[PDB]
Amino acid sequence: GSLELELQNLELLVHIAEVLARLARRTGNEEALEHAARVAEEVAKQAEEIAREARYRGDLRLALEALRIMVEAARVLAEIARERGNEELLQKAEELAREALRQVREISKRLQEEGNIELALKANRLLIDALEVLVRIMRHR
Protein backbone atom coordinates (compact mmCIF):
# COMPACT_ATOMS: atom_id res chain seq x y z
CA GLY A 1 0.00 0.00 0.00
CA SER A 2 1.40 3.34 -1.12
CA LEU A 3 -0.60 5.54 1.27
CA GLU A 4 -0.23 2.93 4.03
CA LEU A 5 3.55 3.09 3.58
CA GLU A 6 3.32 6.89 3.42
CA LEU A 7 1.54 6.88 6.79
CA GLN A 8 4.23 4.60 8.24
CA ASN A 9 6.93 7.07 7.20
CA LEU A 10 4.99 10.04 8.58
CA GLU A 11 4.61 8.38 11.99
CA LEU A 12 8.35 7.67 12.10
CA LEU A 13 9.01 11.25 10.95
CA VAL A 14 7.04 12.83 13.79
CA HIS A 15 8.59 10.47 16.35
CA ILE A 16 12.08 11.48 15.21
CA ALA A 17 10.97 15.11 15.46
CA GLU A 18 9.66 14.51 18.99
CA VAL A 19 13.00 13.10 20.15
CA LEU A 20 14.95 15.77 18.26
CA ALA A 21 12.87 18.62 19.70
CA ARG A 22 13.30 17.21 23.21
CA LEU A 23 17.09 17.04 22.86
CA ALA A 24 17.53 20.27 20.88
CA ARG A 25 15.64 22.23 23.53
CA ARG A 26 17.80 20.69 26.26
CA THR A 27 21.03 21.99 24.67
CA GLY A 28 19.76 25.31 23.29
CA ASN A 29 19.88 24.41 19.59
CA GLU A 30 17.16 26.69 18.24
CA GLU A 31 17.70 25.63 14.62
CA ALA A 32 17.31 21.92 15.34
CA LEU A 33 14.32 22.69 17.57
CA GLU A 34 12.64 24.81 14.89
CA HIS A 35 13.40 22.10 12.34
CA ALA A 36 11.74 19.46 14.52
CA ALA A 37 8.73 21.74 14.97
CA ARG A 38 8.37 22.22 11.21
CA VAL A 39 8.50 18.47 10.55
CA ALA A 40 5.85 17.73 13.18
CA GLU A 41 3.65 20.42 11.63
CA GLU A 42 4.13 19.08 8.10
CA VAL A 43 3.40 15.52 9.25
CA ALA A 44 0.09 16.64 10.77
CA LYS A 45 -0.79 18.47 7.54
CA GLN A 46 0.15 15.50 5.35
CA ALA A 47 -1.73 13.08 7.61
CA GLU A 48 -4.90 15.18 7.34
CA GLU A 49 -4.63 15.26 3.54
CA ILE A 50 -4.29 11.47 3.44
CA ALA A 51 -7.30 11.13 5.75
CA ARG A 52 -9.34 13.43 3.51
CA GLU A 53 -8.20 11.51 0.43
CA ALA A 54 -9.12 8.24 2.15
CA ARG A 55 -12.54 9.68 3.02
CA TYR A 56 -12.99 10.63 -0.64
CA ARG A 57 -12.32 7.02 -1.67
CA GLY A 58 -14.59 5.66 1.05
CA ASP A 59 -11.63 3.87 2.67
CA LEU A 60 -12.62 4.62 6.24
CA ARG A 61 -10.09 2.19 7.73
CA LEU A 62 -7.25 4.05 6.02
CA ALA A 63 -8.80 7.36 7.09
CA LEU A 64 -8.83 6.29 10.74
CA GLU A 65 -5.16 5.28 10.52
CA ALA A 66 -4.26 8.64 8.98
CA LEU A 67 -6.22 10.50 11.65
CA ARG A 68 -4.40 8.52 14.35
CA ILE A 69 -1.12 9.87 12.98
CA MET A 70 -2.71 13.33 12.87
CA VAL A 71 -3.59 13.11 16.57
CA GLU A 72 -0.08 11.92 17.42
CA ALA A 73 1.48 14.79 15.46
CA ALA A 74 -0.79 17.24 17.29
CA ARG A 75 0.33 15.77 20.62
CA VAL A 76 4.01 16.11 19.70
CA LEU A 77 3.40 19.64 18.41
CA ALA A 78 1.65 20.66 21.63
CA GLU A 79 4.47 19.34 23.82
CA ILE A 80 7.02 21.40 21.88
CA ALA A 81 4.85 24.51 22.22
CA ARG A 82 4.31 23.91 25.95
CA GLU A 83 8.03 23.66 26.68
CA ARG A 84 8.61 26.91 24.78
CA GLY A 85 5.64 28.96 25.98
CA ASN A 86 4.68 29.31 22.31
CA GLU A 87 1.00 30.29 22.31
CA GLU A 88 0.62 30.38 18.52
CA LEU A 89 2.03 26.87 18.06
CA LEU A 90 -0.04 25.56 20.98
CA GLN A 91 -3.23 26.88 19.37
CA LYS A 92 -2.18 25.29 16.07
CA ALA A 93 -1.76 21.95 17.86
CA GLU A 94 -5.12 22.30 19.62
CA GLU A 95 -6.90 23.06 16.34
CA LEU A 96 -5.26 20.04 14.70
CA ALA A 97 -6.43 17.78 17.54
CA ARG A 98 -9.91 19.33 17.38
CA GLU A 99 -10.10 18.79 13.61
CA ALA A 100 -9.02 15.16 13.92
CA LEU A 101 -11.54 14.62 16.72
CA ARG A 102 -14.32 15.99 14.50
CA GLN A 103 -13.37 13.76 11.57
CA VAL A 104 -13.20 10.64 13.75
CA ARG A 105 -16.63 11.46 15.17
CA GLU A 106 -18.08 11.83 11.66
CA ILE A 107 -16.51 8.55 10.53
CA SER A 108 -17.67 6.76 13.69
CA LYS A 109 -21.28 7.81 13.06
CA ARG A 110 -21.09 6.69 9.42
CA LEU A 111 -19.67 3.31 10.46
CA GLN A 112 -22.40 2.81 13.07
CA GLU A 113 -25.08 3.60 10.48
CA GLU A 114 -23.55 1.07 8.06
CA GLY A 115 -23.42 -1.58 10.79
CA ASN A 116 -19.62 -1.80 10.43
CA ILE A 117 -18.90 -2.80 14.02
CA GLU A 118 -15.23 -3.74 13.59
CA LEU A 119 -14.36 -0.31 12.19
CA ALA A 120 -16.75 1.42 14.60
CA LEU A 121 -14.81 -0.09 17.51
CA LYS A 122 -11.52 1.17 16.06
CA ALA A 123 -13.06 4.62 15.56
CA ASN A 124 -14.36 4.73 19.14
CA ARG A 125 -10.93 3.72 20.46
CA LEU A 126 -9.33 6.55 18.47
CA LEU A 127 -12.11 8.89 19.65
CA ILE A 128 -11.12 8.16 23.26
CA ASP A 129 -7.42 8.58 22.49
CA ALA A 130 -8.06 11.82 20.59
CA LEU A 131 -9.99 13.39 23.47
CA GLU A 132 -7.21 12.47 25.90
CA VAL A 133 -4.75 14.31 23.64
CA LEU A 134 -7.05 17.33 23.24
CA VAL A 135 -7.76 17.60 26.97
CA ARG A 136 -4.03 17.44 27.74
CA ILE A 137 -3.42 20.18 25.17
CA MET A 138 -6.05 22.42 26.78
CA ARG A 139 -4.58 21.89 30.26
CA HIS A 140 -0.93 22.99 29.87
CA ARG A 141 -1.93 26.44 28.56
Partner: protein, 201 residues
Protein backbone atom coordinates in the same frame (compact mmCIF):
# COMPACT_ATOMS: atom_id res chain seq x y z
CA UNK B 1 -13.41 27.19 35.43
CA UNK B 2 -14.86 27.79 31.97
CA UNK B 3 -11.97 25.80 30.49
CA UNK B 4 -12.83 23.07 33.00
CA UNK B 5 -16.47 23.42 31.93
CA UNK B 6 -15.43 22.89 28.30
CA UNK B 7 -13.40 19.81 29.25
CA UNK B 8 -16.31 18.35 31.22
CA UNK B 9 -18.58 18.98 28.22
CA UNK B 10 -16.14 17.13 25.95
CA UNK B 11 -15.89 14.14 28.30
CA UNK B 12 -19.69 14.05 28.65
CA UNK B 13 -19.96 13.96 24.85
CA UNK B 14 -17.51 11.06 24.59
CA UNK B 15 -19.52 9.17 27.23
CA UNK B 16 -22.76 9.64 25.29
CA UNK B 17 -21.02 8.62 22.06
CA UNK B 18 -19.59 5.46 23.62
CA UNK B 19 -22.92 4.60 25.25
CA UNK B 20 -24.49 4.84 21.79
CA UNK B 21 -22.00 2.23 20.57
CA UNK B 22 -22.95 0.10 23.58
CA UNK B 23 -26.62 0.47 22.63
CA UNK B 24 -25.78 -0.54 19.06
CA UNK B 25 -23.96 -3.69 20.17
CA UNK B 26 -26.76 -4.48 22.63
CA UNK B 27 -29.32 -4.36 19.81
CA UNK B 28 -27.00 -6.60 17.75
CA UNK B 29 -27.46 -9.53 20.14
CA UNK B 30 -30.95 -9.74 18.60
CA UNK B 31 -29.35 -11.49 15.60
CA UNK B 32 -25.81 -12.31 16.78
CA UNK B 33 -20.63 -11.49 18.93
CA UNK B 34 -17.72 -12.45 21.19
CA UNK B 35 -14.57 -10.80 19.82
CA UNK B 36 -16.29 -7.44 19.33
CA UNK B 37 -17.79 -7.56 22.82
CA UNK B 38 -14.33 -7.94 24.35
CA UNK B 39 -13.07 -5.06 22.21
CA UNK B 40 -15.92 -2.85 23.44
CA UNK B 41 -14.98 -3.73 27.03
CA UNK B 42 -11.40 -2.74 26.22
CA UNK B 43 -12.65 0.65 25.00
CA UNK B 44 -14.69 1.08 28.19
CA UNK B 45 -11.59 0.54 30.33
CA UNK B 46 -9.67 3.03 28.18
CA UNK B 47 -12.58 5.46 28.47
CA UNK B 48 -12.72 4.99 32.25
CA UNK B 49 -8.99 5.75 32.42
CA UNK B 50 -9.43 9.02 30.51
CA UNK B 51 -12.48 9.96 32.60
CA UNK B 52 -10.70 9.44 35.92
CA UNK B 53 -7.66 11.41 34.73
CA UNK B 54 -9.93 14.35 33.87
CA UNK B 55 -11.83 14.11 37.16
CA UNK B 56 -8.62 13.97 39.22
CA UNK B 57 -7.45 17.40 38.02
CA UNK B 58 -10.89 19.04 38.24
CA UNK B 59 -11.76 17.57 41.64
CA UNK B 60 -14.88 16.06 40.06
CA UNK B 61 -16.10 13.42 42.49
CA UNK B 62 -19.11 12.53 40.32
CA UNK B 63 -16.98 11.90 37.23
CA UNK B 64 -14.48 9.83 39.22
CA UNK B 65 -17.29 7.62 40.54
CA UNK B 66 -18.62 7.30 36.98
CA UNK B 67 -15.18 6.12 35.84
CA UNK B 68 -15.01 3.51 38.61
CA UNK B 69 -18.50 2.16 37.89
CA UNK B 70 -17.55 1.92 34.21
CA UNK B 71 -14.41 -0.06 35.09
CA UNK B 72 -16.21 -2.48 37.43
CA UNK B 73 -18.84 -3.32 34.81
CA UNK B 74 -16.09 -3.95 32.26
CA UNK B 75 -14.34 -6.19 34.79
CA UNK B 76 -17.58 -8.00 35.68
CA UNK B 77 -18.32 -8.76 32.02
CA UNK B 78 -14.74 -9.72 31.14
CA UNK B 79 -14.68 -12.22 34.01
CA UNK B 80 -17.96 -13.68 32.75
CA UNK B 81 -16.80 -13.94 29.13
CA UNK B 82 -13.51 -15.50 30.28
CA UNK B 83 -15.46 -18.13 32.23
CA UNK B 84 -17.70 -18.91 29.24
CA UNK B 85 -14.74 -19.02 26.84
CA UNK B 86 -12.93 -21.58 29.01
CA UNK B 87 -16.14 -23.62 29.29
CA UNK B 88 -16.45 -23.60 25.48
CA UNK B 89 -12.81 -24.50 24.80
CA UNK B 90 -11.86 -21.06 23.45
CA UNK B 91 -8.75 -20.41 25.52
CA UNK B 92 -7.51 -17.70 23.15
CA UNK B 93 -10.69 -15.69 23.75
CA UNK B 94 -10.44 -16.40 27.49
CA UNK B 95 -6.96 -14.87 27.72
CA UNK B 96 -8.19 -11.79 25.85
CA UNK B 97 -10.90 -11.38 28.49
CA UNK B 98 -8.37 -11.84 31.29
CA UNK B 99 -6.27 -8.98 29.90
CA UNK B 100 -9.29 -6.68 30.07
CA UNK B 101 -9.79 -7.89 33.64
CA UNK B 102 -6.24 -6.82 34.56
CA UNK B 103 -6.61 -3.46 32.80
CA UNK B 104 -9.91 -2.73 34.56
CA UNK B 105 -8.35 -3.74 37.88
CA UNK B 106 -5.44 -1.34 37.29
CA UNK B 107 -7.66 1.72 36.83
CA UNK B 108 -9.81 0.66 39.79
CA UNK B 109 -6.76 0.52 42.06
CA UNK B 110 -5.65 3.94 40.80
CA UNK B 111 -9.04 5.50 41.57
CA UNK B 112 -8.91 3.85 45.00
CA UNK B 113 -5.47 5.46 45.42
CA UNK B 114 -6.65 8.90 44.27
CA UNK B 115 -9.90 8.64 46.27
CA UNK B 116 -9.55 6.92 49.64
CA UNK B 117 -11.66 3.77 49.32
CA UNK B 118 -10.56 0.57 51.03
CA UNK B 119 -13.41 -1.49 49.56
CA UNK B 120 -12.51 -0.42 46.02
CA UNK B 121 -8.82 -1.18 46.61
CA UNK B 122 -9.49 -4.70 47.89
CA UNK B 123 -11.87 -5.12 44.94
CA UNK B 124 -9.09 -4.22 42.50
CA UNK B 125 -6.69 -6.65 44.18
CA UNK B 126 -9.30 -9.43 44.07
CA UNK B 127 -9.74 -8.89 40.33
CA UNK B 128 -6.01 -8.94 39.59
CA UNK B 129 -5.56 -12.00 41.81
CA UNK B 130 -8.37 -13.84 40.00
CA UNK B 131 -6.88 -12.99 36.60
CA UNK B 132 -3.45 -14.16 37.79
CA UNK B 133 -4.82 -17.47 39.09
CA UNK B 134 -6.61 -18.12 35.79
CA UNK B 135 -3.64 -17.02 33.68
CA UNK B 136 -1.33 -19.43 35.53
CA UNK B 137 -3.89 -22.24 35.24
CA UNK B 138 -4.17 -21.57 31.51
CA UNK B 139 -0.37 -21.37 31.21
CA UNK B 140 0.04 -24.79 32.84
CA UNK B 141 -2.77 -26.23 30.70
CA UNK B 142 -1.32 -24.89 27.44
CA UNK B 143 2.20 -25.97 28.42
CA UNK B 144 1.02 -29.51 29.16
CA UNK B 145 -0.82 -29.62 25.81
CA UNK B 146 2.27 -28.37 23.97
CA UNK B 147 0.61 -25.05 23.05
CA UNK B 148 3.62 -22.85 23.72
CA UNK B 149 2.21 -19.75 22.01
CA UNK B 150 -0.92 -19.87 24.17
CA UNK B 151 1.19 -20.55 27.26
CA UNK B 152 3.39 -17.53 26.52
CA UNK B 153 0.31 -15.34 26.04
CA UNK B 154 -0.97 -16.49 29.44
CA UNK B 155 2.38 -15.79 31.11
CA UNK B 156 2.30 -12.20 29.84
CA UNK B 157 -1.11 -11.70 31.47
CA UNK B 158 0.32 -13.30 34.62
CA UNK B 159 3.10 -10.69 34.70
CA UNK B 160 0.61 -7.89 34.03
CA UNK B 161 -1.54 -9.02 36.96
CA UNK B 162 1.48 -9.38 39.26
CA UNK B 163 2.65 -5.92 38.20
CA UNK B 164 -0.67 -4.46 39.37
CA UNK B 165 -0.75 -6.51 42.58
CA UNK B 166 2.74 -5.23 43.43
CA UNK B 167 1.86 -1.54 43.02
CA UNK B 168 -1.09 -2.10 45.37
CA UNK B 169 1.29 -3.68 47.90
CA UNK B 170 3.60 -0.65 47.76
CA UNK B 171 0.74 1.88 47.81
CA UNK B 172 -0.92 0.14 50.76
CA UNK B 173 0.81 -1.30 53.83
CA UNK B 174 0.87 -4.95 52.73
CA UNK B 175 4.29 -6.60 52.46
CA UNK B 176 3.16 -10.21 51.96
CA UNK B 177 1.35 -9.18 48.77
CA UNK B 178 4.61 -7.73 47.42
CA UNK B 179 6.14 -11.18 47.97
CA UNK B 180 3.33 -13.02 46.18
CA UNK B 181 3.45 -10.64 43.21
CA UNK B 182 7.20 -11.26 43.20
CA UNK B 183 6.73 -15.03 42.98
CA UNK B 184 4.24 -14.66 40.12
CA UNK B 185 6.64 -12.42 38.19
CA UNK B 186 9.47 -14.91 38.72
CA UNK B 187 7.21 -17.74 37.54
CA UNK B 188 6.28 -15.81 34.40
CA UNK B 189 9.96 -15.24 33.60
CA UNK B 190 11.03 -18.77 34.58
CA UNK B 191 8.41 -20.59 32.49
CA UNK B 192 9.05 -18.21 29.58
CA UNK B 193 12.77 -19.03 29.61
CA UNK B 194 11.92 -22.74 29.62
CA UNK B 195 9.72 -22.27 26.55
CA UNK B 196 12.49 -20.28 24.86
CA UNK B 197 14.99 -23.07 25.55
CA UNK B 198 12.60 -25.73 24.22
CA UNK B 199 11.97 -23.64 21.09
CA UNK B 200 15.71 -23.60 20.34
CA UNK B 201 16.09 -27.40 20.46
Amino acid sequence: SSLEEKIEELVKELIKHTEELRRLLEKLVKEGSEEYLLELLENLVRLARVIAEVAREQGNEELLEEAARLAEEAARQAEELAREARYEGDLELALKALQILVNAARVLAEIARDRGNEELLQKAAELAKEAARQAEEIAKEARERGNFELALEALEILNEAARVLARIAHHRGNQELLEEAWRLTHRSAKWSREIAEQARK
